[PDB]
Design a protein around this ligand. Structure first.
Ligand SMILES: Nc1ncnc2c1ncn2[C@@H]1O[C@@H]2COP(=O)(O)O[C@H]2[C@H]1O
Ligand SMILES: Nc1ncnc2c1ncn2[C@@H]1O[C@@H]2COP(=O)(O)O[C@H]2[C@H]1O
Ligand SMILES: Nc1ncnc2c1ncn2[C@@H]1O[C@@H]2COP(=O)(O)O[C@H]2[C@H]1O
Lengths: 201, 207
């Protein structure tokens, strides 16, 4: 939930609300502010020259955002961050945050812990993209999804609400191809798809 | 008069609490899967951080050099395992310290944590870029883009037909995550398409 250290930090921040689908951070912007999700979830994405989008990660309540430019001035935001649901996010200037670190470094410890987890997760993603064919990547994804907090249940494993587009942004493939692969998987008796709902055996 | 610190005082302080050892090229410093309880710091040399598929095909997540911390990912939560193998690329001199001791140092001077965090931030930026490239390019494009980027490094040699780089098929394979044989077939194709010239471990990237 929360504690006095986190609340001490938050009392130094201004809270802003972001409707679902609104962009909090744009790639290329000058990085001078740190964010903290008090409520809601977001998606972190990068793009290709022709507009193809790839989702690097989903982040939720309790997660810091916009932290990558904190340790060196003059850096640009490394990706776009968009609200997945309605969000309430705390924000504070890098300058003010660095001053807080000196008062109580524990706040930096908490931020660093999340960066470490993100590097582990992103590195696993590199491996999947390099060693698994699109079919195996989709297979693996239909699992990592049952890990998210928004994940639900079902007698035969668990149910999730994911679209072809969302899957494609995660594995690096068109909606069309994702559709063909999903059909093969349920043909291989691995899953059961019903609209935007899927059953993971 | 007593002299000034040969190098950064905070770094020397940190290193005085570590134990340092020498590792010959090709030696494995960190094995993927081991329980993580210690932090490393490269005093001299360079290493390769790598992962492998079920059959042993290798991919380098990153090269790390003098001044870089290693084995830091298990520091913020106990019970974790090493996320990848770390193998010496050249002869290395590496410092090691327990997470327990490092945490005590952090309490004394938070600056040492700031320094480590700065590196984790940079690694996340670089690794995220790699994810994009792997998602947006097929095997041919990954190799073509890797050659182009190598041609843009300061160590790349100017050539009358473009830029000249020196790298083996094995190293290229390790960067893109494919076999030496695959690199061979694709380099031959790129050459037939008059995009590059290959002669041994010397490649000319046409401009
Ligand atoms: N290699 C890729 N090929 C096709 N689409 C990709 C790739 N990498 C990422 N994508 C994105 O994945 C998205 C999912 O569905 P769309 O076809 O609507 O649009 C897609 C692209 O923007
Ligand atoms: N691989 C990743 N995993 C999780 N979050 C990321 C990743 N890459 C970028 N981000 C977030 O995207 C944010 C947008 O701008 P910053 O680079 O300032 O800080 C970034 C990180 O918080
Ligand atoms: N993507 C990456 N970029 C740079 N270094 C990495 C990456 N992934 C893992 N490492 C290093 O590999 C080390 C081996 O074990 P740890 O997980 O303890 O700490 C790790 C990091 O120091």
């Amino acid at each position: 939930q929360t504690d006095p250290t986190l609340e001490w930090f938050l009392s130094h921040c201004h809270i802003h609300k972001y409707p679902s689908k609104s962009t909090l951070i744009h790639q290329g912007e000058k990085a001078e502010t740190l964010y903290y999700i008090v409520k809601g979830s977001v998606a972190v994405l990068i793009k290709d020259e022709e507009g193809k989008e790839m989702i690097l990660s989903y982040l939720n309540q309790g997660d810091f955002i916009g932290e990558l430019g904190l340790f060196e001035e003059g850096q640009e935001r490394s990706a776009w961050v968009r609200a997945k649901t309605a969000c309430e996010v705390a924000e504070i200037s890098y300058k003010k945050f660095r001053q807080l670190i000196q008062v109580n470094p524990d706040i930096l410890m908490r931020l660093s812990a999340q960066m470490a987890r993100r590097l582990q997760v992103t590195s696993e993603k590199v491996g999947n993209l390099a060693f698994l064919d699109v079919t195996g990547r989709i297979a693996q994804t239909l699992l990592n999804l049952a890990k998210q907090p928004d994940a639900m249940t079902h007698p035969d494993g668990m149910q999730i609400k994911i679209t072809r587009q969302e899957i494609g942004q995660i594995v690096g493939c068109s909606r069309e191809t994702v559709g063909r692969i999903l059909k093969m998987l349920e043909d291989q008796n691995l899953i059961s798809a019903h609209g935007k709902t899927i059953v993971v055996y």
